Amino acid sequence: SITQLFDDLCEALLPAANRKRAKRSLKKVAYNALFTNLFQLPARNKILMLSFDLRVGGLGPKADRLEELVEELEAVGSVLDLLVQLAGSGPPRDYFLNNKHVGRNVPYSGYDCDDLSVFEMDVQSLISREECLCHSMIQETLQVMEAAPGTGLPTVGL
Amino acid sequence: NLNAVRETMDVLLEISRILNTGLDMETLSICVRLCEQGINPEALSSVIKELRKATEALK
Amino acid sequence: PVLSFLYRWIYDGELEDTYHEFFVASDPTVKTDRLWHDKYTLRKSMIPSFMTMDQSRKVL
Amino acid sequence: LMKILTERGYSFTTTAEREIVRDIKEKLCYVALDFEQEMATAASSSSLEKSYELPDGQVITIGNERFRCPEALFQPSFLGMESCGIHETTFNSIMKCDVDIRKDLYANTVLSGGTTMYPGIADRMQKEITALAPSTMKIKIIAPPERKYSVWIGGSILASLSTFQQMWISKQEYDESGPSIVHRKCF
Amino acid sequence: LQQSLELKRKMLRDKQNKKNSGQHLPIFPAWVYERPALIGDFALPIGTLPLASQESAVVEDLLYVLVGVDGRYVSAQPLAGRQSRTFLVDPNLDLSIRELVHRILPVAASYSAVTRFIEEKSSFEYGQVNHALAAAMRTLVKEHLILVSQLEQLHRQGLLSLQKLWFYIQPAMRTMDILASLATSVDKGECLGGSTLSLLHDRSFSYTGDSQAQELCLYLTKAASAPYFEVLEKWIYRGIIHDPYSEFMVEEHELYWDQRYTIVQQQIPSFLQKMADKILSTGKYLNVVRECGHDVTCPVAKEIIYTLKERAYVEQIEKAFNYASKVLLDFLMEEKELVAHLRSIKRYFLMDQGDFFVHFMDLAEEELRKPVEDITPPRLEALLELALRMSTANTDPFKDDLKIDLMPHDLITQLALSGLEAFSFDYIVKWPLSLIINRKALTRYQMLFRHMFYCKHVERQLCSVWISNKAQWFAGAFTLRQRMLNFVQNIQYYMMFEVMEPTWHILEKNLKSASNIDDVLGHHTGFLDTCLKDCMLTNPELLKVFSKLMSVCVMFTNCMQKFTQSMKLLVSGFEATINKFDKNFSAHLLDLLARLSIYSASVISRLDFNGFYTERLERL
């Protein structure tokens, strides 16, 4: 039932540490924020507006995949309308990308070399993450060494 | 029926991963069971954002 | 430290100390309704001066 | 349940037996999709009775009579009630509201009743709510199988809230403007 | 240190034999501890410098001494046998700074004996509770290293001196000093299982007013409870464990009701002592149903964590008790019934059947009369099998359990023999009910059954001489037999309608009010013992008057009378024996009533029904 499903939702989003009075109080905001919208044009078309924004900034086959599933999801319509609202409130290679040295019955295409510049950015993004790691190892310890004892030790905080 | 609603849960799984939502697997299974009742889906987006803000203030 | 035992003495009737630093003492009894008449008397070297004698007897 | 059992011919006169059937009607009771189909199913073969074994030795329950006690929700005159049934009263209520606010009220229609200790009442209720409004829009009903304490859980959240203090009335205004303003300030 | 090697040899050798969940466990890599390269804790003159320069050299070397390594102006002297290693700062230093140094060196001494703890106690031999105990002390080392790094950053910029240093390191002389106290007592002696968790439970009320160290001690014992509760989360929901390190309160074996699971008493922590019996109970009741298969899953499942002043881990044991001891009870009473098996033992041994036994007495009389080395057990089995089939006592499915068994006693083993007085049954029992009702219960049943057999026997023997006499003029024996007959029937009314039949009703009402097998076995052993004590078996003197009574009654009915030697169809020599037997009978009857009088009433009050021999003589 619904009065339990607000208690289960509040459990998954919060790992246990209190957790004896606070769980009852976070179920209170579970009732209290559900009605703020309720106080104050197809459904599958709301997926297509996102599939447009995929193909605009590249990756066609992904946009073909989002529309492939929702068309077999028509044969449940109230479910997808929740997913489209939480889609901008979430978190912020391989041998096969631009290959032509493989394949059997491939038509002629000639040289392209304007996506070869987007063959170096697939790898530049990987190695720029593996340097920001080294930028997040020298910071997380110098932010503790520079400050007085109490910032990494709870006991000198007593 | 449970074979049928299993396969609908699998297809709903993939569309919620490529859209990079704030949900995970278990909270997705809760919300699909919740909207199965008839609960307004514009309403569940307003509760989850505020519940996740009030839980983050404890941490 | 002394107050910690005293707020389990009026909410659980027990002390939990081992160095005997409060006036309440527990004397072994036959446990046949002479507990009331034999067990609890004050140790008159361990009463704090922040507790008056009326308070010391009422918590007992 | 006293009435139909004593009309049936079974000896039932005492208050302790009434306490035991009140307990069994609230907790153990079977309800199904409809009373006619389960009546035919029980008449063709009897296995609907689950035994109740108390140490006192009083065994009173029978399966077929306990689902036909709340039957007044679909056809009310099985109880001998001249008041219209549950489906008919909610249909009568939504017709005498406005036709413009009808869909919005029908977007949240609510189930209640302490009889939700046994779940299964909601499925038949969902069938009757499908039958209730004409085929114009789909059903949007809130129907959880725990609603016995619904009136309680409402007040427990409502009176706690700090914003609700601006609707709550104190003694100062109450002495300044008489008692009758508790109809208006608080409502 | 040498001791560790011995502690690792004694442990593993102790582990393998103790339980069967895996034997001959591997020996941990010893070369790790042998090489001194894995041990944590370990220039210019200090004399010729001005006083402030001495202060600046000394705070520099003390910052290095905070962990175990000597810097420049400090050296390491031997560790010799001391359990808290001090350091030897560079000689020729002034006596002013020596005092400040000796204020600070106990902190490094309370770190030297924590690294020597952790970097030894992680092996397989030390169990798997010493692992997580030393990984809640391993976190503590990491915050100590945070401390020494922050101080190095301050020290380079001239922002560290002796007083600031002493101010910074004092909360860790009450959070690392605590570990330097527990370490030199956990290592000393053999400390496994719950005893370590109790040694972290007695130090939460030796600093309960201090309030800085109590929460540290509560964290330490919430992490040493983590591996123990993993094993308990096998034992509480199913009857088995597989923890081949004997670090548990329960010790498995390879043997069921008391044999396979034997408790070790120094492996139960102080917050599990009160509920130890329930833990053992739950696991045993689960495993014996796991042997008939059928179901072992518990509906409630909860993950377990320690709480001081709360129950969430000494609470779930009750909900496992109320599932395990109820599913075993349900399995027993409704599948291969113990409600019906006890009734079918009562049916024969406690003489519920009367069709069966009067048919049995007549059909088997001849062989019973035959003494030993003339008795024939297969003919007795065949006679029993016919007597069951002709009578209606065949209403129970366990009738076949009756066999022929011989007793080489005439209840003289109560603290060869003729066929009447060696007769016995052996009733076979099934395996699930064998754990509950054992050999002692059957033997006590059997002695009761033998006792009532004599009374039914001598009753038949009186009725035979009674029918043969009915001469007509003769009525001499007709009076003595009548006295004896009324007596031997009033004993069989008193025993049957006082000792046995109401107390059996009491027993079946008590069994309905019992939810654990210990309760139902207590009820049954009480009923069995008390009914035995009321009859003439289990007594401090055995009350031998009854044993002489049966002998003189059988001697009267056939072995002197010979059915009044066919004068019913000698010279009054047998009438004198009738007189003699009556006087002897009066004596025996008075003695039995007197012994009932002196030891702690209803049989006297009704044998003497209208004052019929309430007075015949007085003792002394």
Side-chain angles (χ1 to χ4, degrees):
Chain A
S1 145
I2 62 171
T3 173
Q4 289 79 6
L5 286 171
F6 286 122
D7 202 9
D8 313 304
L9 265 184
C10 85
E11 190 37 75
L13 303 167
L14 192 41
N18 199 353
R19 76 228 166 280
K20 48 186 297 193
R21 74 98 190 160
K23 205 181 182 182
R24 175 57 187 159
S25 161
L26 177 73
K27 201 162 84 182
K28 177 223 70 184
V29 304
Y31 300 117
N32 285 342
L34 190 72
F35 57 72
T36 302
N37 74 291
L38 306 157
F39 279 19
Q40 289 197 326
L41 214 68
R44 72 185 295 177
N45 284 18
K46 309 182 178 297
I47 302 292
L48 320 174
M49 72 145 286
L50 308 169
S51 76
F52 203 50
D53 296 358
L54 315 178
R55 297 185 183 94
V56 161
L59 278 299
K62 195 276 155 181
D64 306 321
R65 181 67 180 270
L66 196 44
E67 66 204 34
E68 267 158 349
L69 268 65
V70 307
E71 188 135 9
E72 80 179 328
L73 286 156
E74 324 279 359
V76 309
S78 44
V79 190
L80 71 93
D81 313 315
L82 179 55
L83 310 172
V84 297
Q85 304 293 320
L86 315 169
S89 161
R93 39 196 204 164
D94 201 1
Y95 319 131
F96 294 131
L97 163 69
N98 299 134
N99 55 81
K100 183 42 216 82
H101 299 248
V102 77
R104 172 181 308 194
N105 289 343
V106 198
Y108 180 67
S109 316
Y111 285 141
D112 172 278
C113 65
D114 61 31
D115 71 352
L116 198 67
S117 50
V118 308
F119 197 23
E120 50 91 8
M121 278 299 184
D122 294 291
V123 65
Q124 177 57 254
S125 45
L126 164 66
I127 63 171
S128 61
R129 290 187 290 263
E130 296 193 299
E131 61 201 60
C132 85
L133 286 166
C134 171
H135 294 354
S136 88
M137 306 328 160
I138 190 179
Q139 291 335 303
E140 66 168 82
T141 298
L142 287 188
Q143 301 335 288
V144 185
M145 279 185 67
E146 189 66 43
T151 59
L153 307 88
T155 290
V156 284
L158 274 299
Chain B
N1 187 14
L2 64 91
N3 293 177
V5 303
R6 185 165 83 241
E7 85 209 332
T8 70
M9 173 267 315
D10 308 312
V11 172
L12 283 166
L13 186 64
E14 310 322 298
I15 60 174
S16 41
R17 305 289 86 52
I18 58 192
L19 217 47
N20 196 29
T21 189
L23 308 159
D24 308 324
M25 179 49 234
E26 186 268 2
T27 58
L28 180 71
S29 78
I30 300 177
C31 72
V32 299
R33 189 172 35 240
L34 272 155
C35 55
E36 172 186 336
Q37 189 39 61
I39 301 301
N40 179 254
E42 311 92 301
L44 298 159
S45 310
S46 46
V47 66
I48 293 312
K49 296 168 182 177
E50 298 281 82
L51 264 48
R52 284 178 325 176
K53 290 164 205 133
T55 182
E56 276 160 342
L58 312 186
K59 294 175 282 191
Chain C
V2 177
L3 258 60
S4 49
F5 321 130
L6 162 68
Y7 297 139
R8 307 196 275 254
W9 171 238
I10 204 199
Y11 286 134
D12 204 358
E14 68 187 0
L15 286 72
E16 300 174 42
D17 62 331
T18 185
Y19 296 102
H20 293 309
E21 307 298 62
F22 191 41
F23 62 79
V24 176
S26 198
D27 312 314
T29 308
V30 189
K31 311 298 300 304
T32 318
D33 306 314
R34 310 276 85 174
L35 198 170
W36 185 279
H37 314 282
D38 295 332
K39 191 158 173 63
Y40 288 114
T41 174
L42 73 174
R43 192 187 306 128
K44 295 144 294 293
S45 88
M46 298 286 187
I47 294 100
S49 58
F50 50 78
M51 293 178 70
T52 77
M53 50 173 179
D54 176 32
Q55 288 203 35
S56 308
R57 292 186 287 120
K58 71 182 186 145
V59 304
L60 204 80
Chain D
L1 271 189
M2 185 288 312
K3 176 261 153 199
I4 54 167
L5 180 84
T6 55
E7 182 180 58
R8 164 183 174 234
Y10 188 58
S11 40
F12 185 82
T13 76
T14 184
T15 42
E17 219 181 357
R18 181 83 158 278
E19 271 315 281
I20 294 191
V21 305
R22 180 162 190 202
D23 183 358
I24 294 158
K25 179 62 173 65
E26 172 176 76
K27 313 309 207 188
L28 291 87
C29 172
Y30 191 92
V31 309
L33 184 47
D34 185 287
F35 77 104
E36 302 269 65
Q37 51 87 25
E38 180 183 17
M39 212 189 321
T41 300
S44 45
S45 77
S46 61
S47 165
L48 169 55
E49 176 54 9
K50 178 41 200 157
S51 64
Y52 193 55
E53 302 95 305
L54 308 164
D56 175 33
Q58 190 193 294
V59 191
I60 181 181
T61 312
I62 187 165
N64 49 354
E65 270 79 76
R66 63 177 187 257
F67 77 89
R68 309 196 70 200
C69 191
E71 182 189 321
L73 86 195
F74 190 64
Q75 314 293 23
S77 160
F78 189 73
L79 182 148
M81 200 165 65
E82 292 285 83
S83 296
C84 286
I86 290 195
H87 72 91
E88 192 149 72
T89 51
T90 303
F91 183 79
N92 200 3
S93 169
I94 197 53
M95 69 84 58
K96 59 182 64 195
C97 313
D98 195 18
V99 311
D100 274 26
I101 202 49
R102 168 156 188 183
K103 62 91 194 167
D104 189 40
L105 260 63
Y106 214 77
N108 194 223
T109 184
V110 185
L111 299 202
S112 314
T115 193
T116 328
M117 175 48 228
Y118 174 76
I121 189 74
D123 312 277
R124 179 173 183 174
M125 288 334 101
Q126 290 247 9
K127 169 264 299 180
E128 292 169 59
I129 198 73
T130 59
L132 199 143
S135 44
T136 75
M137 73 274 287
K138 54 98 173 184
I139 293 308
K140 198 172 283 200
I141 186 173
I142 192 162
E146 274 114 301
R147 195 97 195 189
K148 170 176 197 163
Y149 282 151
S150 53
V151 284
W152 170 254
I153 60 171
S156 58
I157 192 179
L158 184 74
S160 323
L161 293 194
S162 159
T163 40
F164 192 47
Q165 175 253 350
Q166 297 91 75
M167 209 180 184
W168 193 281
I169 197 40
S170 195
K171 51 203 160 300
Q172 311 83 68
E173 177 265 18
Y174 175 91
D175 60 70
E176 306 299 332
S177 80
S180 185
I181 201 141
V182 308
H183 187 59
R184 316 318 295 121
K185 175 74 169 63
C186 154
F187 199 49
Chain E
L1 196 52
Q2 159 72 25
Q3 308 199 278
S4 175
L5 267 292
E6 295 175 353
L7 294 154
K8 287 196 293 299
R9 324 278 66 74
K10 281 200 301 294
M11 274 287 163
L12 179 62
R13 178 71 273 171
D14 279 351
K15 296 321 181 67
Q16 296 165 10
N17 55 86
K18 269 175 198 192
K19 47 172 58 170
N20 280 349
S21 166
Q23 297 83 24
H24 184 266
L25 275 298
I27 300 174
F28 198 83
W31 46 80
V32 168
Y33 309 107
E34 300 162 6
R35 296 155 177 161
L38 297 94
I39 298 172
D41 61 323
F42 295 122
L44 299 192
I46 201 65
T48 64
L49 318 181
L51 177 73
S53 63
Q54 315 287 22
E55 193 265 333
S56 48
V58 76
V59 196
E60 160 155 49
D61 76 6
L62 301 194
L63 163 64
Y64 294 124
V65 172
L66 290 189
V67 290
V69 56
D70 49 67
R72 285 191 76 161
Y73 298 90
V74 57
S75 83
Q77 80 283 20
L79 68 91
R82 296 181 289 103
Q83 284 300 134
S84 179
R85 292 181 62 194
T86 317
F87 292 79
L88 174 61
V89 288
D90 185 20
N92 311 324
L93 179 135
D94 197 18
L95 78 167
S96 300
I97 298 183
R98 285 282 164 152
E99 184 63 84
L100 292 150
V101 162
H102 294 330
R103 295 185 321 125
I104 298 173
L105 284 194
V107 188
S110 55
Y111 193 73
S112 292
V114 308
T115 55
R116 291 178 291 172
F117 180 90
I118 300 173
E119 290 179 356
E120 195 57 65
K121 312 295 182 300
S122 311
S123 306
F124 310 144
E125 292 84 2
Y126 287 128
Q128 289 179 355
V129 187
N130 210 346
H131 293 175
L133 173 147
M137 176 179 172
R138 193 190 310 259
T139 45
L140 302 178
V141 175
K142 278 174 166 165
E143 294 102 11
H144 183 92
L145 307 187
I146 298 173
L147 171 134
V148 71
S149 204
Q150 298 162 309
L151 312 180
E152 182 174 298
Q153 180 68 41
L154 263 68
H155 170 239
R156 289 187 169 177
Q157 304 167 340
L159 308 171
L160 267 206
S161 67
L162 281 172
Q163 149 63 26
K164 312 173 187 175
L165 180 58
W166 179 241
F167 167 59
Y168 297 155
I169 66 175
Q170 62 92 18
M173 211 191 164
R174 212 146 183 89
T175 311
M176 287 294 204
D177 208 355
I178 302 300
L179 278 302
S181 73
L182 300 154
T184 63
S185 61
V186 166
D187 300 327
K188 275 74 173 173
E190 281 74 55
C191 306
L192 207 54
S195 63
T196 52
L197 280 89
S198 289
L199 188 54
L200 304 155
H201 180 84
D202 49 28
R203 305 281 301 264
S204 47
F205 299 112
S206 55
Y207 299 112
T208 183
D210 176 43
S211 60
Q212 209 273 313
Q214 174 182 247
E215 296 317 318
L216 167 65
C217 208
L218 286 177
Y219 165 68
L220 285 159
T221 194
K222 206 177 285 177
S225 62
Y228 189 99
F229 288 162
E230 280 178 69
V231 183
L232 188 46
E233 278 177 299
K234 318 180 169 79
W235 171 259
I236 199 60
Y237 299 125
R238 299 181 333 276
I240 64 168
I241 61 168
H242 298 296
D243 178 23
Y245 287 97
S246 171
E247 52 191 42
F248 196 28
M249 58 180 294
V250 194
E251 182 166 296
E252 209 161 65
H253 278 77
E254 65 276 17
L255 309 167
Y256 280 95
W257 205 252
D258 57 336
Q259 310 189 342
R260 191 175 153 178
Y261 306 112
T262 314
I263 58 167
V264 177
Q265 70 273 17
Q266 62 166 77
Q267 301 293 101
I268 322 185
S270 54
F271 37 85
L272 286 182
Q273 319 287 67
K274 297 173 185 174
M275 216 156 303
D277 64 324
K278 299 294 187 290
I279 295 170
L280 185 64
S281 305
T282 46
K284 290 183 164 295
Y285 307 152
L286 283 166
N287 188 59
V288 308
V289 190
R290 213 181 175 274
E291 194 175 286
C292 74
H294 165 253
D295 195 41
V296 73
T297 50
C298 191
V300 61
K302 282 190 179 184
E303 199 160 291
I304 303 176
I305 191 168
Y306 164 80
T307 44
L308 180 74
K309 309 305 201 301
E310 298 83 52
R311 49 190 304 163
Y313 63 104
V314 285
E315 156 197 292
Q316 325 173 350
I317 302 174
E318 282 51 50
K319 307 183 262 185
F321 176 50
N322 290 345
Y323 189 71
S325 50
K326 296 190 175 158
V327 294
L328 166 61
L329 167 60
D330 205 347
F331 166 68
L332 289 170
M333 299 302 211
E334 279 86 345
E335 285 79 62
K336 282 314 208 144
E337 313 169 62
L338 196 47
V339 287
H341 212 291
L342 294 171
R343 283 170 165 166
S344 281
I345 297 174
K346 184 255 170 183
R347 192 196 276 273
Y348 302 105
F349 276 72
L350 305 186
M351 283 190 184
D352 194 11
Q353 287 312 119
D355 305 347
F356 181 69
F357 270 101
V358 302
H359 212 53
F360 177 78
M361 256 299 188
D362 290 331
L363 289 177
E365 175 168 70
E366 322 96 308
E367 300 288 312
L368 286 165
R369 180 184 293 154
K370 294 205 296 194
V372 73
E373 306 177 76
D374 180 27
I375 304 167
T376 62
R379 210 163 295 195
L380 316 179
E381 185 61 32
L383 280 164
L384 165 77
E385 299 318 275
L386 173 57
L388 174 69
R389 286 290 156 123
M390 185 67 147
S391 89
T392 307
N394 183 345
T395 74
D396 50 315
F398 293 132
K399 57 205 169 63
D400 202 6
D401 301 342
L402 302 161
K403 283 304 175 193
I404 300 304
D405 189 13
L406 279 298
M407 197 191 285
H409 297 109
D410 201 2
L411 313 183
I412 63 171
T413 179
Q414 178 48 241
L415 57 90
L417 279 303
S418 158
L420 314 161
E421 46 189 65
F423 164 75
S424 312
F425 287 156
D426 201 34
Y427 198 98
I428 61 171
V429 65
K430 321 206 302 301
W431 191 263
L433 324 170
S434 311
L435 294 91
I436 296 102
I437 55 165
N438 304 15
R439 181 63 189 158
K440 309 301 200 181
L442 184 59
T443 46
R444 283 175 298 160
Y445 294 148
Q446 171 173 59
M447 303 292 277
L448 282 151
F449 170 53
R450 299 278 269 129
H451 171 63
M452 52 191 79
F453 194 78
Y454 304 139
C455 323
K456 78 184 276 230
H457 174 61
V458 301
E459 187 259 310
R460 306 302 286 121
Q461 308 334 299
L462 187 153
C463 300
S464 41
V465 66
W466 179 96
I467 195 50
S468 47
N469 220 351
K470 299 167 71 72
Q472 281 67 60
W473 160 83
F474 177 60
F478 270 94
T479 305
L480 173 143
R481 66 88 177 146
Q482 167 62 33
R483 311 214 327 150
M484 292 177 148
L485 170 59
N486 192 31
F487 163 69
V488 71
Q489 284 179 358
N490 292 15
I491 299 299
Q492 289 286 271
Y493 299 146
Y494 171 74
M495 287 181 173
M496 292 301 291
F497 313 132
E498 181 264 320
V499 194
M500 317 309 173
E501 291 318 300
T503 67
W504 174 251
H505 191 277
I506 294 164
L507 181 71
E508 57 82 20
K509 291 321 184 223
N510 307 326
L511 310 197
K512 294 161 50 169
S513 45
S515 316
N516 47 299
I517 302 301
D518 186 37
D519 198 2
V520 68
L521 63 84
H523 286 133
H524 177 58
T525 182
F527 157 85
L528 172 51
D529 196 12
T530 300
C531 298
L532 186 47
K533 183 167 281 308
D534 303 324
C535 277
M536 276 75 82
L537 281 301
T538 298
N539 277 288
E541 300 191 309
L542 314 181
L543 311 180
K544 311 176 172 65
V545 51
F546 174 65
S547 45
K548 308 185 281 181
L549 266 165
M550 51 171 98
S551 50
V552 308
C553 293
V554 61
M555 278 153 79
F556 164 65
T557 179
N558 55 1
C559 307
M560 51 82 98
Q561 198 64 224
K562 189 248 142 186
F563 295 169
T564 311
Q565 61 272 4
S566 316
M567 196 180 282
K568 329 161 138 185
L569 307 168
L570 180 49
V571 298
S572 193
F574 79 119
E575 305 199 76
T577 61
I578 297 171
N579 303 355
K580 175 165 69 67
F581 280 21
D582 217 316
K583 299 175 291 188
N584 302 2
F585 176 66
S586 279
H588 312 150
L589 175 60
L590 180 64
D591 282 357
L592 78 92
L593 306 162
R595 288 202 204 278
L596 187 92
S597 73
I598 190 167
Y599 301 124
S600 56
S602 158
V603 60
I604 300 180
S605 317
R606 73 183 272 259
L607 264 177
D608 300 333
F609 173 66
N610 273 358
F612 295 139
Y613 319 117
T614 33
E615 65 293 329
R616 76 198 76 182
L617 276 201
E618 173 66 22
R619 46 80 181 159
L620 172 63

